[PDB]
Amino acid sequence: MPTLFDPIDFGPIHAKNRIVMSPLTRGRADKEAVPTPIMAEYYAQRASAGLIITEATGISREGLGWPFAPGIWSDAQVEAWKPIVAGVHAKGGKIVCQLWHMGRMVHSSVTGTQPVSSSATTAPGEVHTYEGKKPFEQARAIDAADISRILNDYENAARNAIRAGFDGVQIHAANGYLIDEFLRNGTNHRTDEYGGVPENRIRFLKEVTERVIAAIGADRTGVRLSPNGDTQGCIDSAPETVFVPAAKLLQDLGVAWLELREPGPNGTFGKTDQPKLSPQIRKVFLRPLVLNQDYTFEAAQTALAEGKADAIAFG
Ligand SMILES: [Hg+2]
DSSP states (O other): OOOTTSOEEETTEEESSSEEEOOOOOOOSOTTOOOOHHHHHHHHHTTTSSEEEOSOEESOSTTOOSTTOOBOSSHHHHHHHHHHHHHHHHTSOOEEEEEEOOTTSSOHHHHSSOOEESSSOOOSSEEOOTTOOEEOOOOEEOOHHHHHHHHHHHHHHHHHHHHHTOSEEEEEOOTTSHHHHHHOTTTOOOOSTTSSSHHHHTHHHHHHHHHHHHHHOGGGEEEEEOTTOSSTTOOOSOTTTTHHHHHHHHHHHTOOEEEEEOOOOSSSSSOSSTTOOHHHHHTTOOSOEEEEOSOOHHHHHHHHHTTSOSEEEEO
């Protein structure tokens, strides 16, 4: 029965309503990925929304390949977010920081290093750089040390989020970035614990999630997933083999909520779940499920009313 105007809770986060502002990568931060004063206003305007998820924010330079994106590994960065975050709260808002490791979707001319991924692969297309576009470089496959470091940067990133004042964190595990790369058999060829069976493709996610929930609480922790990707075109043959278990695990670990990004209804009047994911995921994940599609309001108001999701994302 709920509507977009009804309250909802994300763990301890008492969201005023069921709208989620989840911005695309504005890209207006400085070259050291420190937020800037414009960003205060950009975020403060969106305070009316039940909850705000930030633009995806780097946990590490290695993982941040997008020019002028912000991050949150540094003390400087934390200090910059602070006023931005407090701006939002002043206006009675809620806001949660989105944790990005781009994986293989970066260029070493920006990260200063070779792209890292679950396995040594090369993404298709070109990549943006402060010098304009370029051929993707092959990646190198993460090893145990790397993993331990990456895991470090995620935990630090979350902790730093809470230091700046975020009401929580969302682990970005979606859109063919680093965690996604591990989950997909096509991007993951490892023969260690982290590869092979579905249960192993899942391990990397588990381990990231575990650190984070250990660090600030499963009740302040969300994950974003995107089985058919972030874009018109793709359709995962059998998303129940990995993604459902993924979700089941997230339930069990205590995770507060789950955004599920899915390239948006194809007509105007075209269907909401087309790919009928939510019912599969609802089967195993019982807390709030956010659907993020590129959505007209009427469309949103629908899904929510049709039971498909508990709140809806826009940007
Ligand atoms: Hg994205």
